[PDB]
Every structure is written in structure tokens, then in C-alpha cells.
């Protein structure tokens, strides 16, 4: 038995073609794993509370109270794009294909290790290693996806790049169920916000523990285990961003004068004046068609309230947004529109020597140009005397109930019948694969999280912990201290993917911009003398289309 | 699985018969390997440096600088002649045979293990060992070859020769894109000759990493593992040297007049004048025909530059040379018109009680006797007055610019229409045995290392490192410094080549020079009473044969 | 030995002595086995003479080179060791508005980089007695017949036993497609025109 | 860089146009006291580099536009002042080892950065 | 490392000085000399010993080898005052000495 080894270790990426543009991308990888033995022992219920913060008049949200249940075990998983795919290799999957389709998942774990710590005392102590064969180690994995779910990149604790490295998963937790309740506040406020816990609504409780529902294959080792192959549900993804805006929708007017010396400050004429003009318009009194006012076939994208927080069960809540900054240049800070800033540590960046810890953090924009710039925006009566007077209409620049930094347009939104806008670009690598699926019935239009959702059912994860021992000593169900051997055990992981592309095509006049090495991150691809590496975010929505 | 074992433990050299001259030789070996764990573990980017002296003025090379990238593995490889050969079974294939053909090679991997260290303090301290199961080796072996190429020995790193004697790899390593300029110096030399390094060019850079290509079978110790054979795709090679240089292509002159007493100062005549010879010519005013002067099928050899260091990528660095010393028994040091001269130590001579260290240096001259001796080379005018006056030709004591060691010797260069010569001997037991092909088109016409090409594709290697463990405590994608538990393995190793060959056939009336044992070298085959060992050079090609 | 700290100037150690060293070589003392001096499979690239005319029934006319120049930072004017400049007009650039009419030129380098530098090259006895004293070796500044433009590298060429490159890089769009083929028989193995 | 305490962000930025020879990759921002110090000698990024001190990283690209960056926070308590940035610039080091050395010119005197 | 000494000089213009250094670890002829020439400042004046250059030549001029060096001023005048520097230059780092304070007595 312990004199076989059954696994083999894959990290490669091989494209296997097709007939008429279909083109199987088929990426294998793989890590090294070491685990810890948890040093809790039963599930454990626990309340976070920090009040001096929200106490202190002002403060809408520095942080809030959550109550988790803890496991003892621990879960590996797939789903970034750093665990499977290299920077040498992104670069041909993104210049070469308009597409993409999900296909199939599927992970073995074999060859596991397991190891015991004898610690001396009159000794320095030393560590003595032993390899002991009868231990145990655990695998719970459901296909059913009964018990509940997270993925886990809302801050990227998952499995490390490269496969050199090890890697270690986390332990896995879940939200209760509670109620909370906080009144604003300013730094002007008087008396106090009345900041109050409330308990928890015993008509609904979820305790959910796999041992009472998913069965454990227990390992020894020589042994292996694999899971089966559970295929996706899902529709495509574009790789190539729209550029045209609402100005390039429709067909242009036509210039009755034609400009004549080259190199330019040369201005073409619409030739006629403004009240001549003859077209279709929406409009109230319309002796004037413009380029602006003019019929469009629709919006797109969709002004939001930004910085909104609506209240609710966890009270103070940021309320997300689907559009990217684009055509928006004045306003950065991180992510000003929204601009979904990943913070990451350690683990994928940072460069791999960095003493003490810190994290690390970069803003990525859109590459899509679809313009909700706020400033730039007002309103006016339906008379349209123009030139317009101050007191008839309005600017951003006007209060609300006599405020500043509210403009109006704090409170706005519109949504509604024209509106569209492309699925989230996907990012890299610190970006998300895949995402399970809303389960009530009106099933929000996309995600600002993952580019692809399965309709029906994603696959599962995959859960392990140490297998318990005892020397001599015990109780029959205490929560009294047990005496435990300090153990931990290794194993090896693989993985498999599968996609399906298309090759674009040209028709253009115009080359068109790709990722490539320069000198501007001369070597942020190139490891350092002491071992250092980055694997610094790239940015890919690159390629331009045509829209309407 | 542990209480077996599957593998045996071959030397020999089994002589297979056929029909009409062809015989296979059928060689096997086999070597045990004992390998360090790597200290290091990222892959690691270094650039070296020395300058002082190339900042001193003077000193053309006497280093330059180099960047390589580091893996941790390490490189168990064939291709040398000691590692399946013996100086006994050496005889009985040079006596014996004028061809050889390459065919097939493979090798497998069998019964490994994995042992331990745990290194006490308080005690002496002693090394405890003690035999681990669960550990494990990771080999990863590509036929592709797409992952870069070396064969070993541009140094002879490569395993030892005997089968009683462990031997180990070597760590690999390859060269990366950098840019050099380097600017001429000598004592003379007044200001500062501009020696500069020059960043690296982005648009090109290779970090090739296996574990991003090539699968690896992973190995706990009953197991085996075997690659399959690759044949090989090549021409043969003579082991006949050619003799005749450019006097012997021709039917020699007729005397007119026969000597007469025996014993020697005896000269016969041609017996005409000069004038009045007869026969074909090529020369600018024959009233003369000599032994020297008259037309040849075609030259032998090519006169080269010797000494010349052209500019690159790594600036300065020396042009070989494909011929042979032969014919020039007055230049010697090392290898003057070029002799290729092996410099290796400890492992295959330097008799192997050695105090310290220090290398093994012998000149290996040719065998084959094609006269490119400088000395004795000048031109003439086309008028051809003779005895020639000193103003109207040249001599190699001639300056250019002023100069001494240059004659005009040092620029010259012919190789063109007539040329051939024959491919490099075989050397032993320094040398190698197949060498990879070159990439671009052109495929140069031979190699001055290698006797055999593939003209396909040339089998892989083999390479092979510790699996890494952990006892308790990690940072995931850390270049900080993660604890080890030191450990070293061993693993038998086997090898099989097939070659074909013919046996020659008298045909002369004179026997013919052979290898033997004399008294010159009485011992340099016995070991000495320590375990002395040597193997001293040997040279073949020792069958002159007829030319034109 | 392996360098530690991050960032640079950190410089491994060969780690040996210049002695001691073990591996092939082709030299004619060898106490020195180097990074530069040591064997190799063959060459790459060869050193031409460049500006060197031949004559012929037309007497004067430019003798072609097939590398390209990379390596070589230093030497530009118009292609230097050469890089076949194209010069057109009026009708694939030179934007379409000109007034009158000039020619249109750049320089095409090469992007392959196999160095053909002249400068930094020269040549020792087979002494090798180091360093070297300026009697007994050559360099670039060293005249021709007491000349100057000349240095020795004017007259050299190999390209003999060892040689090889790269079919001429196709460019675009001033180039070549196809080209027809010699009518001799020893047939050119290339040609520094078309792919 | 600053003002003033305890490590805000930015407020680094000279010279454009023509910052120098592009070599991949040059200095200098001037650099520094002073009387001191400093500052060992930006290299280029993944992994090229780098400044003695650590949250001393540097990163620009060489082409147009040619800028610099950050420069950076780092470590202030020292009350030390460099506050211009201006070029030639000679030879960086890495790019360098002549051996080393010089350095001709400098340009734009006292920008001071407080405390 | 480098160190810059003797300091508390008054002279008249034009008259000579001498002006050294000492090192540890051996530095060829590395050694160079930093010299207002006020403004733009410092505006080196002799590369590693010795260039006269940069901008015109005989205004000071340097000498010496190893771990030591002489700096020496041949033509003093108002163009040139106050206080100046020696750099060594050898591996990582780079290092400054300080000062000499050198201003025309009056």
C-alpha cells in the first residue's frame, strides 16, 4: 500500500485546435499544501464587537458587528485566475480571442502525508519528526451544495500562485443570523446616536454542520481521491469593450462644408444654421437640433446614487454599482464612480521580501468608456429660453437643504427603460471565476463580482481537517479541555479546466492595442536575486468594437 | 509495495552478431546517485560581476559578464564516453571497425529512498537517520524539449565513470538576455578604455520555468519510473583519418631516372629541366610545372584567423576552429592552431588521491594530419621573376601598421569554393557523445564538439529534485524564509545505448597502428594501492585510409 | 557562492579561481577557461568586409551583407554594418500632401541581435602572455599601410567551417515577396532581398 | 513624500522634458541632504532594483511621457529634505561599473520639504 | 570609509592648498572631487584623477592612487569659496564624506 504512489503533478497549458475558429484552452495546475491541526475542537459561536468607534459622534461607518459560527476544519479552493494562469500565458488567450465559454471542473487529491511533533522540555527542545502511517486525515466534499456557500475571494485568502510555493487554506466560517439598528451622526451632532445590539430572531437559525449532512471519505495513506466531473451552466463572456457612447449612436449630420489645409486647427461646418435643421428630436420647443439633442435609440449605462448607504437588518450598507469611470478623468482617489479596488497581501504581490507586513493596493478602472461623469450635469424647465437664467435652472454647484458636498446629485437615479451596459470585465489575477446563483426568483440581471454564473447549480468546494487523536484522558461530550498530539499533514493538489474560444478577425484599417513588455514595467515580470517575485495586476478588456 | 524491489544493476558490454560485416555493440550502464536537497528555493535571477580586470588597462578577456537563472533542480545526464565505456572494451571497437551508426537510447529509475537528518544539540551532536516512507522525489523528464537545452560538457560537471563510485548532478542552469559592450585596452593604452554594462532589452525575454510546461511523476519508494525509447536520427562517422594532404591528389611526376645503391643518400631525378615539363597548370607564366605548382582536384582544409575575438551581444569571444594541428610539430603551448584541450579534475583523473585540489590538464593534439602550419606562407605579383626580390613579395616577418606579433597571418581567410575536411574525431573519455541541432536554417556544416548530430530532434534529459516539507508554520507566496527539514535521497540509476558498426578488412601489405599496452604508460590501467584510479586520455582515430 | 540582499549592484562569485577551473576549451595555454574563452557547437553571424567594392565587368559595385546590425548601439549613420534602407516617395508615404517633391528615408534596423561589432575586436599570439603588451598583439587603432578610415577590419572575413543564420527578415510595406532563383548551379543559400 | 507628517502621499514629480538618457533605467532626483547621503540606485521593476532602505521603491517609465514616481512616503520623522528632482544625471549606477563612477552636472537649486 | 579633513583655512587669492583623504577598502583610482563653482551646485570639476576638464582646464587639479588622495587648488579666486565634498565610489552604496570650509581670508 504506502509502497505505491498513484498521482502525477501538472502545471502546463496546451491548446488543442479545432475546425472553424472553436479552440479548446486547457489549463491544468496545481500547489503544494501544508495544514495546520485546528486548535479549536467544537463549533463555536462568537460575537465581534468594537464600540468606541461608532460610539463617537460622526463615524457612519468605520466598521459594524457580525456573528459568525467557526469550524474547526478548513477549506481549500479554486476560483482566481492567479492559481491557474500565467502572465507569460494570459498574453495569447487575450490578443488572439473575442470569447469565451465555461465547460467542466474537476479536482483529485493524492498521496497525502502525515506528520507528529514530539515537543522535549529538558531538551533545547529539538523537534522530532515522526512519520506516523495509522493517523487520519479527513475529506468532506458535497456535490449537493446543501450546506451553505461562499466563495472566497472578498478578500483573496485563497490558495497562493505559483507552483513552487506552498499554500495554506482557511479556516471557514458563515454568517448568523441577528439584528441591528444605528442612527446617523456627525461630528456637530448633539446627544447621543442611540447605537443598540437587538439580539436575534429565534423564528429563523441556521446552524448549518456538514457532519450532520455530507459524508467523509477518511484517508490513510497510500490512498486517493478524486471527484467526478460537474459541468457548468453558463453564457459567454465578451472580451472586447464598447467604446461608443451615446454620441455614437445614429448616423452623423452631414457637413455642407468641407475644411481645406492639412495639419489642424481646421473646423468643418454644419452649413446650416440652427433653426433650419430638419430631423427627428425629443424635445419641448425645438427651433434648435443640435448633435446633442437629438433621438437616440437608447442610454446607456445608468447615472446611480453614489455613496448611499440604505439601512437594513446590518443597517449601513454600501450600495454597489455596475458601471465603470470611464470618460471620467478629474476624479480618481480609488474608484471614484466605482472602481473595484482590490487590496491583497503577501501572497500575490508586494514583492515577495517585504518586511514586517503592509498591505498592497491599486485601483483598476474600467477599460470600458461608458461616461457617468456626474459634473456636467443639470437640468432645466420645458420653456428653453436660452440663453438660460440662473434662477430657472440648476447646477451642481446648488445645495440640497443647504449642504455642500451633496450637489443634487447624491439623490438621483434612473434605470429605467432604455438602459443597458456590458457584464463586468474580468480582472487579473486577483479577479473571481466563477459565481453560484441568487436563489430567489427575479435573479439580478449580472453580478459586479464574477464575469460568468452557473443558471442552475455550480460545483462545490472541497473541505478537510486533521483527523483527532487522544492519548489517555477524556470526558463523554465536554467542552473541558481534551489533551491533544500536535499534528499537521501535507498533500498534494490538482486541478482542471476547461474553455472554449474563437479567434477574432480583422476588418478593420487599424492595428489595436495588446499587452506586451516595455519599458515602463521593464521587469515586473522577472524574479528578484533574493527570490522576489510580484506577478503585478494587468488590466484586460483590450480590445474595440462595433456597438449599435 | 516497500517489500519488493523491481530493478537489477547492469555493466556490461555484450557483442551481438549479423551477417556481413554489421555488428551491433550493445553498451549498458549504471551509476548510484546520492543528491543534496537544494538550499535555495525560488527560482533566482543573479548577475555576476568581477571588474578590476577588465578595468585594468590591457587584459582582452580574462573574464566577461554573465545572468543566469537558477532553478532549484538538478541535472543526472549522459553524454560522455566514460560513463559507458571501458578502457578495456575501448580496444576491441577502434582495432576492429572503420563506421559507426547511432540508434536508440533510454533509461529508467528504480528503487529510490529517502532518508533523514535530525541534528541534536546538546549531544555530541550525533546524526540520527532514520528511514522515511511518506517522503518523496519528484522527477520530471520531457520528451518535447521544448523546455531549453545544455547537454554537459562545456565543463564536465557530468556523473562520475566506474560503477562502484556514487556520483551527483548538478544544479541547472541557462543563460538570459542581457547586452554587453566591451571597448579594446593594452598596457599602452592612456585614458580609460569604456567598459559598461547595458540593461537588458525588454522586447525579448525567456524565464523558462518546467513546472509551467513538462508533467512530473511523483515518486514514494517502491515505485519505477521509465521512459520509453527515442531513436535517433544521424549520419555515421569514420574512424579513419585521412592522411593525404594536398601533395598526395594527383599521380606523381614520372622519373627519367632510376637511383642505384642501397641505403640512404639516394636521390632519383626527375630528368627533365624545368622548362620543358609537360602537364596541366594553373600559374601566371609557366615556363615551370613543379611538385608544388600545378593543379589540384581541390584543396584540404581551410587556413583561419587564429586568435581573433569577434563582437556580440557578449562583445569579445573566440571563433573556433575545425581543423586539426597535424603537419605543425613547432607550435605547441596548448592547442595553437587549436587542438582541443580538456581540463577536468577529481572525478576522472588527477589520480583520485589528491591532497586539496588543483585541475588536469593534457593537450589533446589530432590524429589527422592536415597541414594549416602558418609558418611558411607568403604570396608573390603575378610576374613571377625569380629569385624574387625582397620589395616585390611577402614574408610572415612582415609588420602591419607597425606592428610585430601579427604577421599577416592573423588576417586571412580562405574556406570558399574548394574546401572540405573531415568531421571532428570522437575524444574519450572527456568527450561527448550527440549534441542538438541548431534552430535556424542554415544548419552549419558540423560541429568542432560533437561527432553526431541529430538532424531531428535530439532525446531529452532527465531531471529530478527533493519533494520540499514543512514542519509547522508558513506565509503563503513568501520569499521570507520558510523552515526545512534537512534531507537527502538516493536512487539507483540505469542506462542502454545501441550502436552498429562494421568491421574493416585488410587490404594493405603493412599492419597498422593500434592501441595497446607498453611500457610508456605500464600502469595507467591498475588502480594503485589507496584506490588510485586514473583513466588517462586516450586518443582515436588511428586508421589511416586512402583519400582521392 | 549566492549573492542575499535585494536590489542591486549584487554580484555572484564564480566561486573557483581562474585556475582551477574544469571543462573544455580551445587555447593554446590554458591555465584560463573563462566565460568568453571556452568551446562552443559554432559561430553565429559572420564578419564581413564592409565598404569594399570588387570590380567586375561593371567594375565598381557594393559587396551585400546578410546579418543585421544588432549588437551594435553605437554605429548608425544609415545602416551601418548595414540595414537595408528603403528610400520611396510620393506613393506609399511621405504624406500624400507634399509640396513638390523630395525623397522619403529610415533606416531599417534588424531586430535579430546577432552581433557583428567590429570595434572591440582584435587578435594575440599564441603566447598568451597576460596582460598583454602592446608589441605583441593588434587593436582597431592600429593603420593599414599608414592609413587611418582603415583599421584591420576592413580586410577580415570567416563565415567558413561553422557559420549560420537567419533568413533575411521579410519587411513592410516597401519589401518583397517572392524572388526568382539563380540560373547557375551552386545556387546561393539565400538572398538578402526577398524572404 | 509630503508635507508634512506623519506619511502622507506624493509630491514628487520633476523634470519634463528630456530627463535623460534612457539606459533602463537612470536617476537623479537630487539626491540628497545635501550633505548626505543615500539612496542606492533605482533599477527597473517585477524584480530590478533597488533603494537601502526599504518603502524607498521607485518606478517610472523611460518613455514619453517621461516622468518619475512616487516619490513615495517614506519614513519623515527625520526631518531630512530633498525637494527638487532635476537631471543630468550621468551614469546611474546599474548601468555603471567602469568601475562606477562619476557624475557631471545637476540643475534647479534649494526645493526644501519640511519635516 | 571617506572622511574629509584638514578644515579652518583662510588664504589669500590665488595661493595653493593642500587637500586629502583616506579609505579603507582598496579603491583603485576611483576617487573624485565635487566643486562649487557655486550654482547650479555642486557641479563636479575633475573626474577620477585626473581630468582637468569640466568646465575649462587647469583650475584645480587632483592626483594620487589607492586609499589616498591630494587635492590641490592652483588658481584661487572669488569665483570660487566656501566648502566642498569627496565621494568614494565602489559597490553598493554609494558613501559622502563631508566638508573642508575653505573661504578667502579677509
Known amino acids: 500500500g504506502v509502497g505505491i504512489s498513484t498521482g502525477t503533478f501538472n502545471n502546463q497549458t496546451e491548446f488543442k485546435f479545432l475546425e472553424n475558429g472553436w479552440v479548446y484552452i486547457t489549463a491544468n495546475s496545481s500547489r503544494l499544501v501544508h495544514l495546520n491541526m485546528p486548535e479549536s475542537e467544537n463549533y463555536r459561536r462568537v460575537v465581534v464587537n468594537n464600540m468606541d468607534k461608532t460610539a463617537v459622534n460622526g463615524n457612519m461607518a468605520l466598521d459594524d458587528i457580525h456573528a459568525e459560527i467557526v469550524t474547526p476544519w478548513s477549506l481549500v479552493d479554486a476560483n482566481a485566475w492567479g492559481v491557474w494562469f500565467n502572465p507569460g500565458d494570459w498574453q495569447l488567450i487575450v490578443n488572439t480571442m473575442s470569447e469565451l465559454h465555461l465547460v467542466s471542473f474537476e479536482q483529485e487529491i493524492f498521496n497525502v502525508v502525515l506528520k507528529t511533533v514530539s515537543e522535549s522540555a529538558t531538551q533545547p527542545p529539538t523537534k522530532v519528526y515522526n512519520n506516523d502511517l495509522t493517523a487520519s486525515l479527513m475529506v468532506a466534499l458535497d456535490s449537493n451544495n446543501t450546506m451553505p456557500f461562499t466563495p472566497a475571494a472578498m478578500r483573496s485568502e485563497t490558495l497562493g500562485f505559483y507552483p513552487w510555493k506552498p499554500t495554506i487554506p482557511t479556516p471557514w466560517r458563515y454568517y448568523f443570523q441577528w439584528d441591528r439598528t444605528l442612527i446617523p451622526s456627525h461630528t456637530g451632532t448633539s446627544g447621543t446616536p442611540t447605537n443598540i445590539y437587538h439580539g436575534t430572531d429565534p423564528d429563523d437559525v441556521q446552524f448549518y454542520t456538514i457532519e450532520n449532512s455530507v459524508p467523509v471519505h477518511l484517508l490513510r495513506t497510500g490512498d486517493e481521491f478524486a471527484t467526478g466531473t460537474f459541468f457548468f451552466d453558463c453564457k459567454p463572456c465578451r472580451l472586447t469593450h464598447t467604446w461608443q457612447t451615446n454620441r455614437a449612436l445614429g448616423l452623423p449630420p452631414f457637413l455642407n462644408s468641407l475644411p481645406q489645409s492639412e495639419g489642424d486647427t481646421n473646423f468643418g461646418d454644419i452649413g446650416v444654421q440652427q433653426d433650419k435643421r430638419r430631423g427627428v428630436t425629443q424635445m419641448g420647443n425645438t427651433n434648435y437640433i443640435t448633435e446633442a439633442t437629438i433621438m437616440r435609440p437608447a442610454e446607456v449605462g445608468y447615472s446611480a446614487p453614489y455613496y448611499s448607504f440604505e439601512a437594513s437588518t446590518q443597517g449601513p450598507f454600501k450600495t454597489p454599482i455596475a458601471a465603470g469611470r470611464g470618460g471620467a478623468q478629474t476624479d480618481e482617489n480609488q474608484a471614484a464612480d466605482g472602481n473595484p479596488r482590490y487590496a491583497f497581501g503577501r501572497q500575490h504581490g508586494q514583492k515577495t521580501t517585504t518586511t514586517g507586513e503592509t498591505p498592497e493596493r491599486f485601483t483598476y478602472i474600467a477599460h470600458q468608456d461608458t461616461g457617468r461623469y456626474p459634473e456636467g450635469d443639470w437640468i432645466q424647465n420645458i420653456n428653453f429660453n436660452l440663453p438660460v437664467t440662473n434662477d430657472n435652472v440648476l447646477l451642481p454647484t446648488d445645495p440640497i437643504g443647504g449642504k455642500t458636498g451633496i450637489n443634487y446629485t447624491n439623490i438621483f437615479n434612473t434605470y429605467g427603460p432604455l438602459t443597458a451596459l456590458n457584464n463586468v470585465p474580468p480582472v487579473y489575477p486577483n479577479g473571481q471565476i466563477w459565481d453560484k446563483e441568487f436563489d430567489t426568483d427575479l435573479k439580478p440581471r449580472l453580478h459586479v463580482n464574477a464575469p460568468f454564473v452557473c443558471q442552475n447549480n455550480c460545483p462545490g468546494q472541497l473541505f478537510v481537517k486533521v483527523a483527532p487523536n487522544l492519548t489517555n484522558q477524556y470526558d463523554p461530550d465536554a467542552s473541558a479541555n481534551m489533551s491533544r498530539i500536535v499534528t499537521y499533514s501535507d498533500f498534494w493538489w490538482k486541478g482542471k479546466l476547461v474553455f472554449k474560444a474563437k479567434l477574432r478577425a480583422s476588418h478593420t484599417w487599424n492595428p489595436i492595442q495588446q499587452m506586451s513588455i516595455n519599458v515602463d514595467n521593464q521587469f515586473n515580470y522577472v524574479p528578484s536575486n533574493i527570490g522576489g517575485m510580484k506577478i503585478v495586476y494587468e488590466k484586460s478588456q483590450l480590445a474595440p468594437r462595433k456597438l449599435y | 509495495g516497500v517489500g519488493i524491489s523491481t530493478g537489477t544493476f547492469n555493466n556490461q558490454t555484450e557483442f551481438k552478431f549479423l551477417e556481413n560485416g554489421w555488428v551491433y555493440i550493445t553498451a549498458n550502464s549504471s551509476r548510484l546517485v546520492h543528491l543534496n536537497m537544494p538550499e535555495s528555493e525560488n527560482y533566482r535571477r543573479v548577475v555576476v560581476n568581477n571588474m578590476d580586470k577588465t578595468a585594468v588597462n590591457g587584459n582582452m578577456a580574462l573574464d566577461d559578464i554573465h545572468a543566469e537563472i537558477v532553478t532549484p533542480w538538478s541535472l543526472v545526464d549522459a553524454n560522455a564516453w566514460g560513463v559507458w565505456f571501458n578502457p578495456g572494451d575501448w580496444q576491441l571497437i577502434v582495432n576492429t571497425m572503420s563506421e559507426l551508426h547511432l540508434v536508440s537510447f533510454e533509461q529508467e529509475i528504480f528503487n529510490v529512498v529517502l532518508k533523514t537528518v535530525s541534528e541534536s544539540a546538546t549531544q555530541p551532536p550525533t546524526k540520527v537517520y532514520n528511514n522515511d516512507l511518506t517522503a518523496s522525489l519528484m522527477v520530471a523528464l520531457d520528451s518535447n524539449n521544448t523546455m531549453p537545452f545544455t547537454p554537459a560538457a562545456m565543463r564536465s560537471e557530468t556523473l562520475g565513470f566506474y560503477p562502484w563510485k556514487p556520483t551527483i548532478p548538478t544544479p541547472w542552469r541557462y543563460y538570459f538576455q542581457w547586452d554587453r559592450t566591451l571597448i579594446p585596452s593594452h598596457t599602452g593604452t592612456s585614458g580609460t578604455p569604456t567598459n559598461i554594462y547595458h540593461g537588458t532589452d525588454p522586447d525579448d525575454v525567456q524565464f523558462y520555468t518546467i513546472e509551467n510546461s513538462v508533467p512530473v511523476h511523483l515518486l514514494r519508494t517502491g515505485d519505477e519510473f521509465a521512459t520509453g525509447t527515442f531513436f535517433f536520427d544521424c549520419k555515421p562517422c569514420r574512424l579513419t583519418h585521412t592522411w593525404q594532404t594536398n601533395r598526395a591528389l594527383g599521380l606523381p611526376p614520372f622519373l627519367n631516372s632510376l637511383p642505384q645503391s642501397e641505403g640512404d643518400t639516394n636521390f632519383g631525378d626527375i630528368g627533365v629541366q624545368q622548362d620543358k615539363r609537360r602537364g596541366v597548370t594553373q600559374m601566371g607564366n609557366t615556363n615551370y610545372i613543379t611538385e608544388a605548382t600545378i593543379m589540384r582536384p581541390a584543396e584540404v582544409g581551410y587556413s583561419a584567423p587564429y586568435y581573433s575575438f569577434e563582437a556580440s551581444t557578449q562583445g569579445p569571444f573566440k571563433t573556433p576552429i575545425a581543423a586539426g594541428r597535424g603537419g605543425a610539430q613547432t607550435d605547441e603551448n596548448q592547442a595553437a592552431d587549436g587542438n582541443p584541450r580538456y581540463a577536468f579534475g577529481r572525478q576522472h583523473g588527477q589520480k583520485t588521491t589528491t591532497t586539496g585540489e588543483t585541475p588536469e590538464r593534457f593537450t589533446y593534439i589530432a590524429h589527422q594530419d592536415t597541414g594549416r602550419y602558418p609558418e611558411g606562407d607568403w604570396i608573390q605579383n603575378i610576374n613571377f621573376n625569380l629569385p624574387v626580390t625582397n620589395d616585390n613579395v611577402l614574408l610572415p616577418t612582415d609588420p602591419i601598421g607597425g606592428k610585430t606579433g601579427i604577421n599577416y597571418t592573423n588576417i586571412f581567410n580562405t574556406y570558399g569554393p574548394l574546401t572540405a575536411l573531415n568531421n571532428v574525431p570522437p575524444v574519450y573519455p572527456n568527450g561527448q557523445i550527440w549534441d542538438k541541432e541548431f534552430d535556424t536554417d542554415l544548419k552549419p556544416r558540423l560541429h568542432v564538439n560533437a561527432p553526431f548530430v541529430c538532424q531531428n530532434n535530439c532525446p531529452g534529459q532527465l531531471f529530478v529534485k527533493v519533494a520540499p516539507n514543512l514542519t509547522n508554520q508558513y506565509d503563503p507566496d513568501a520569499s521570507a524564509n520558510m523552515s526545512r527539514i534537512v534531507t537527502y535521497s538516493d536512487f539507483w540509476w540505469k542506462g542502454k545505448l545501441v550502436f552498429k558498426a562494421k568491421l574493416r578488412a585488410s587490404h594493405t601489405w603493412n599492419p597498422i597502428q593500434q592501441m595497446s599496452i607498453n611500457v610508456d604508460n605500464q600502469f595507467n590501467y591498475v588502480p594503485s594501492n589507496i584506490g588510485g584510479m586514473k583513466i588517462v586520455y586516450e586518443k582515436s582515430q588511428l586508421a589511416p585510409r586512402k583519400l582521392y | 557562492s549566492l549573492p542575499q540582499s535585494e536590489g542591486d549592484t549584487n554580484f555572484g562569485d564564480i566561486g573557483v579561481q581562474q585556475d582551477k577551473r574544469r571543462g573544455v576549451t580551445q587555447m593554446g595555454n590554458t591555465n584560463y577557461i573563462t566565460e568568453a574563452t571556452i568551446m562552443r557547437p559554432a559561430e553565429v553571424g559572420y564578419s564581413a568586409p564592409y565598404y569594399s567594392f570588387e570590380a567586375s565587368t561593371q567594375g565598381p559595385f557594393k559587396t551585400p551583407i546578410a546579418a543585421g546590425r544588432g549588437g551594435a548601439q553605437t554605429d548608425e549613420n544609415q545602416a551601418a554594418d548595414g540595414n537595408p534602407r528603403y528610400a520611396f516617395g510620393r506613393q506609399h508615404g511621405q504624406k500624400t500632401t507634399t509640396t513638390g517633391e523630395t525623397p522619403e528615408r529610415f533606416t531599417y534596423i534588424a531586430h535579430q541581435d546577432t552581433g557583428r561589432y567590429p570595434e572591440g575586436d582584435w587578435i594575440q599570439n599564441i603566447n598568451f602572455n597576460l596582460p598583454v603588451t602592446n608589441d605583441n598583439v593588434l587593436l582597431p587603432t592600429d593603420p593599414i599601410g599608414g592609413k587611418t578610415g582603415i583599421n584591420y577590419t576592413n580586410i577580415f572575413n570567416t563565415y567558413g567551417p561553422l557559420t549560420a543564420l537567419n533568413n533575411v527578415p521579410p519587411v513592410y510595406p516597401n519589401g518583397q515577396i517572392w524572388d526568382k532563383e539563380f540560373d547557375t548551379d551552386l545556387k546561393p543559400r539565400l538572398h538578402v532581398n526577398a524572404p | 513624500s509630503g508635507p508634512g507628517l506623519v506619511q502622507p502621499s506624493q509630491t514628487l514629480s520633476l523634470t519634463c522634458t528630456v530627463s535623460g538618457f534612457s539606459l533602463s533605467s537612470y536617476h537623479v532626483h537630487w539626491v540628497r541632504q545635501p550633505p548626505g547621503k543615500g539612496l542606492e540606485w533605482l533599477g527597473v521593476?517585477?524584480?530590478?532594483?533597488?533603494?537601502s532602505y526599504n518603502l524607498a521603491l521607485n518606478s517610472r517609465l523611460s518613455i514619453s511621457r517621461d516622468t518619475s514616481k512616487s516619490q513615495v512616503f517614506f519614513k519623515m520623522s527625520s526631518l531630512q529634505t530633498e525637494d527638487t528632482a532635476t537631471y543630468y544625471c550621468?551614469?546611474?549606477?546599474?548601468?555603471?561599473?567602469?568601475?562606477?563612477?562619476?557624475?557631471?552636472?545637476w540643475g534647479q537649486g534649494t526645493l526644501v520639504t519640511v519635516s | 570609509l571617506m572622511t574629509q579633513i584638514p578644515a579652518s583655512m583662510s588664504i589669500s587669492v590665488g595661493d595653493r592648498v593642500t587637500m586629502n583623504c583616506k579609505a579603507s577598502q582598496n579603491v583603485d583610482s576611483n576617487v573624485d572631487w565635487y566643486q562649487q563653482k557655486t550654482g547650479q551646485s555642486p557641479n563636479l570639476l575633475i573626474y577620477?584623477?585626473?581630468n582637468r576638464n569640466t568646465g575649462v582646464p587647469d583650475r584645480f587639479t587632483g592626483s594620487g592612487s589607492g586609499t589616498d588622495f591630494t587635492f590641490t587648488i592652483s588658481n584661487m579666486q572669488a569665483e570660487d569659496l566656501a566648502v566642498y565634498y569627496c565621494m568614494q565610489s565602489t559597490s553598493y552604496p554609494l558613501t559622502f564624506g563631508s566638508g573642508t570650509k575653505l573661504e578667502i581670508k579677509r
Open positions: 550621468a551614469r546611474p549606477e546599474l548601468p555603471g561599473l567602469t568601475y562606477g563612477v562619476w557624475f557631471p552636472y
Open positions: 521593476m517585477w524584480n530590478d532594483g533597488d533603494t
Open positions: 577620477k584623477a585626473s
